[PDB]
Amino acid sequence: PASIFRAYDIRGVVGDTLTAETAYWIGRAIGSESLARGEPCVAVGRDGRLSGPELVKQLIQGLVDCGCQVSDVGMVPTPVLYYAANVLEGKSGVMLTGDHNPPDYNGFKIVVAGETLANEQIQALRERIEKNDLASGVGSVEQVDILPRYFKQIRDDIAMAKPMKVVVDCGNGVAGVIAPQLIEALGCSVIPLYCEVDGNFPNHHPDPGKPENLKDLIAKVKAENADLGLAFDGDGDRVGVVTNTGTIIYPDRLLMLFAKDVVSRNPGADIIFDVKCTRRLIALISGYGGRPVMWKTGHSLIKKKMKETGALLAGEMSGHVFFKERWFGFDDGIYSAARLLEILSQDQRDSEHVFSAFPSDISTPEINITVTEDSKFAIIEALQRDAQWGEGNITTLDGVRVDYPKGWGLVRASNTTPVLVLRFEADTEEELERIKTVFRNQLKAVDSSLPVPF
Ligand SMILES: O=P([O-])(O)O[C@H]1O[C@H](COP(=O)(O)O)[C@@H](O)[C@H](O)[C@H]1O
Ligand SMILES: [Zn+2]
């Protein structure tokens, strides 16, 4: 089924669209692709899902039947798998994960020879299977215990000044295997919330991008008078943040704090953010002498862009934050949490006042309009072709973004759902609704039937 080969990764329903047999052939396809790039060595990890044991053995056998040398790192967060692919012999790795999709989902995040696959590169794996353009060989499997290396890597490079008390919510995802322990080892007291790994995800699904999944966290932070709240998503490559007073700090505001710190030590450094992030981030980066690079949404696309630009830091609005400075340049919520605590601990102000000090504007959440999968990209192309946007700085690298003096707006197509994704920001509520109006008029110009929920 080509439907499981997605823009950023592979994702399927275990049994239905993703079976044991398909996991094997995906392994052969990846192993074959790795060998074609001259990399026999592949690390393999999995998240906390129930299907993980079943499917990962098939992934591994697929790799091994190509002649690949597999390093099995067991059940780890996604960033720990990316880490393994940076410190072991090979620069390839596959993470078996369904991230924060419902329990029955699983999938693959794939790096081959240092490069995170996306778009045509993921299609190329399906194509190898169909064509039987597959390597055959007698590979090897080695058990590798990678967590302690990861844990010590971070701990030894992080220096907190003051002690902090932190609520850590892992939503019963695999971040529980290390984030509470690592964070404590930095010099914090950790209040654990849903830190037990449970593939059933009994409490709230680990999706920090939705405020409903941060309610328990916010509540505990306040109840325990904690210095900060942290939530990790299913596989640990997203982080969500809450202040001592329960304010949700969206990832583009988090990136402002990170950009200030990275740019400070690294004059001129390129800093990447996706099209969903506040314009205030463009200003800030530039004001500290950095180079802002706006790019496409999607972690694979962002990681590729970091290689093309030499960026020292990237972030997406969904909460993937990619440090190259002092790190390896992959997205990692657990490392980003540590880098955050390091910065906050130097400050005599509480976390609410650190973040409230930066400019904040009136801002919508991410807005979604469900359209048909047939129509979503065409709608955008129509907006790019047909629509007169004047006027503002118009960016078309991913959807249509328009930047004005006192605000901005975005419409893009999701690469994971049949939806249009919108965000609007302005200095004032008045300006915000004026930008909303323009976008609503332009969508209804393409198709008067289109839902416009804003
Ligand atoms: O969970 P992941 O690792 O696949 O991460 C991906 O999930 C979402 C799907 O993107 P889209 O807006 O195109 O649907 C994005 O918001 C996020 O930025 C991206 O990295
Ligand atoms: Zn994730």
Swiss-Prot record:
**Which keywords has UniProt assigned to this entry?**
Alginate biosynthesis, Isomerase, Lipopolysaccharide biosynthesis, Magnesium, Metal-binding, Multifunctional enzyme, Phosphoprotein, Virulence
Question: Where does this protein act, in terms of pathway?
Answer: Nucleotide-sugar biosynthesis; GDP-alpha-D-mannose biosynthesis; alpha-D-mannose 1-phosphate from D-fructose 6-phosphate: step 2/2; Bacterial outer membrane biogenesis; lipopolysaccharide biosynthesis
Q: What's the effect of swapping E316A?
A: Reduces KM and Vmax approximately 2-fold
* Chain positions covered by the region annotation Topological domain 2: 150-246
Region Topological domain 4, as annotated, extends over 366-444
Q: Give the protein's cofactors.
A: Mg(2+)
Induction info? By D-mannose 6-phosphate.
Activity regulation per the record?
Answer: Requires glucose 1,6-bisphosphate (G1,6P) as an activator. Reaction making glucose 6-phosphate is subject to substrate inhibition, reactions making mannose 1-phosphate or glucose 1-phosphate are not. 1-deoxyglucose 6-phosphate competitively inhibits glucose 1-phosphate. Inhibited by xylose 1-phosphate.
Which residues carry the post-translational modification Phosphoserine, per the record?
D99
Per UniProt, alpha-D-mannose 1-phosphate binds at: Y8, H299, E316, M317, S318, G319, H320, R412, A413, S414, N415, T416
Report the catalytic activity: alpha-D-mannose 1-phosphate = D-mannose 6-phosphate; alpha-D-glucose 1-phosphate = alpha-D-glucose 6-phosphate
> Tell me, which GO biological process terms does this entry list?
alginic acid biosynthetic process; GDP-mannose biosynthetic process; lipopolysaccharide core region biosynthetic process; O antigen biosynthetic process
Task: Quote the record's cofactor note.
Answer: Binds 1 Mg(2+) ion per subunit. Zn(2+) can substitute, but yields a catalytically inactive enzyme.
Question: According to the UniProt record, where is the region Topological domain 1?
Answer: 4-133
Q: What happens when the gene is disrupted?
A: No longer expresses O-antigen LPS side chain or A-band LPS, sensitive to serum, resistant to virus E79. Has no phosphomannomutase nor phosphoglucomutase activities. Does not make rhamnolipid.
**Thermoactivity:** TM is 66 degrees Celsius for phosphorylated protein and 62 degrees Celsius for unphosphorylated protein.
Q: Where is this region: Topological domain 3?
A: 251-355
Residues where alpha-D-glucose 1-phosphate binds: Y8, K276, H299, E316, M317, S318, G319, H320, R412, A413, S414, N415, T416
The annotated subunit structure for this chain is: Monomer.
Q: What is the recorded function of this protein according to its Swiss-Prot or TrEMBL entry?
A: Highly reversible phosphoryltransferase. The phosphomannomutase activity produces a precursor for alginate polymerization, the alginate layer causes a mucoid phenotype and provides a protective barrier against host immune defenses and antibiotics. Also involved in core lipopolysaccaride (LPS) biosynthesis due to its phosphoglucomutase activity. Essential for rhamnolipid production, an exoproduct correlated with pathogenicity. Required for biofilm production.
Write down what this protein is called.
Answer: Phosphomannomutase/phosphoglucomutase
Q: Which organism is it from?
A: Pseudomonas aeruginosa (strain ATCC 15692 / DSM 22644 / CIP 104116 / JCM 14847 / LMG 12228 / 1C / PRS 101 / PAO1)
